[PDB]
Structure 1
Amino acid sequence: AHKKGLGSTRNGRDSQAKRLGVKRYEGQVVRAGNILVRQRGTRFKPGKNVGMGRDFTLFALVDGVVEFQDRGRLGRYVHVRPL
């Protein structure tokens, strides 16, 4: 019977989710190498005993305890307090 023609959608695309965010929260015991934050750019900055990778990934340089610090206009920092 009378079925009308249709168009289509120029959309339908999206990329895979990237599983970003903080991975260890303040007060968690971590080992050297433990990734602490996954992020685009420096939403968090590396503090004491924390390195940063080429993709802004924050990881622990020593065994210890994660600590967060908000320094106002200077940004938010992730530290690792040695045990």
Structure 2
Amino acid sequence: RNGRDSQAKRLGVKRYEGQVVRAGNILVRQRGTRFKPGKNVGMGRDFTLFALVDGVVEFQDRGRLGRYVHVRPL
């Protein structure tokens, strides 16, 4: 009857604040906009967040507007 399960999907954010990232680096793996894309961040067809420029990762909590991942160029 039971016995089933599916593969762990290794979700979560992959770069924290202060980390230097090259451009297309993945920043968050997620389901839906747990984190919304911010400055210099794009969002792929599966809500993956990624840096659009070389820079320093920065997180922002904007209340009911959600949490945001940004990349600040250096």
Superposition TM-score tier, normalisation by shorter sequence: over 0.9
Unmatched 5+ residue regions in structure 1?
A: 1-9
Matches of 2:8 and 2:65, distance apart in 1: 30
Match in the other structure for 1:17:
8
Identity %: 100
Deviation at 1:14, TM superposition (A): 0.1
Count of residues paired in the alignment: 74
Instruction: Give the strand-richer structure, 1 or 2.
Output: 2
> Which runs of at least 4 in structure 1 moved beyond 6 Å after TM superposition?
none
TM-score under structure 2 length normalisation: 0.99
Structural RMSD (CA): 0.2
What's the CA shift for 1:20?
0.1
Q: Distance in 1 between matches of 2:33 and 2:15?
A: 16
Given candidates 43, 49, 52, the residue that maps to 1:52 is 43
| Residue 60 of structure 1, CA deviation | 0.2
Gaps of 5+ in 2: none
Q: Which protein has the larger Cα radius of gyration, Structure 1 or Structure 2?
A: 1
